[PDB]
């Protein structure tokens, strides 16, 4: 009846401009049990001088909208119609639940009948500083049937 477990993907450090960049940095969340909360942290423009000045988030309306595969296209889709009963609070620690505040959170429901995979991107690869390029952070959420 209550959630006591959370998976956290936190890119706070991994997307900084690097000489090897841009690189893909991946965080996979595989869920196969009910009522798991998922929290994704991505750095904000201006959180450090330079370093994130051109960061972007995909989908811009995460977590309500996610990237997911439909045929041979990655499409932006409403999460609440991909997975019925998911809980998304409008705010997270009194701020908008949106990557413009640095954090998104949602809680998966008691039952999922079909394997469902979706993605979020925190993309720093347009930020350039001193010959270095930021990285592209990708979160893959892989929900297996449960309940």
């Amino acid at each position: 009846a209550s959630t006591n477990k959370e998976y956290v993907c936190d890119f706070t450090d991994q997307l900084k401009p690097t000489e090897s960049g841009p690189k893909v940095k991946k965080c996979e969340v595989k869920v196969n049990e009910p009522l798991i909360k998922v929290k994704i942290i991505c750095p904000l423009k201006g959180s450090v001088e330079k370093l994130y000045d051109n960061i972007e988030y995909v989908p811009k309306k995460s977590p309500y909208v996610v990237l997911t595969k439909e045929e041979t296209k990655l499409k932006e889709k409403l999460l609440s119609k991909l997975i019925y009963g998911l809980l998304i609070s409008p705010t997270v620690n009194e701020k908008e639940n949106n990557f413009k505040e640095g954090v998104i959170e949602f809680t998966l429901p008691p039952v999922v009948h079909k394997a469902t995979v979706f993605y979020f991107i925190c993309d720093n690869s347009k930020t350039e500083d001193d010959n270095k390029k930021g990285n592209r952070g990708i979160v893959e959420v892989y929900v297996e049937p449960y309940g």
Partner: nanobody
Amino acid sequence: QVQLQESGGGLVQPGGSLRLSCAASGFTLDRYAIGWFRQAPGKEREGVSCISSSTYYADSVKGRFTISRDNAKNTVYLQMNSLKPEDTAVYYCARDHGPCTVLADILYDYGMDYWGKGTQVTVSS
């Protein structure tokens, strides 16, 4: 004044060849990944190939298409051999600040910018 210009389209018979050109104007494209996409009329655009600053090939063109980059010519090429009628479509090129990114065997295109106007490819007997 940044620009990407596709050319090389044409009309051939099955088994023929074309070479598509993606020419950069106003930046050097070897700091960017370059992706080739195609859209048959009425259908969804699909990834064909990508070269980063490895390489991506859609399963359907493996062994027939080759992507390459000429740093001096500020151009990325797509050599298309053994063309089939299924390859008919408008072909587009675009640039990505990030690496060629593939998720679930799909070329990720949300980072793609400065899409060229496109070049027509027709394979018919």
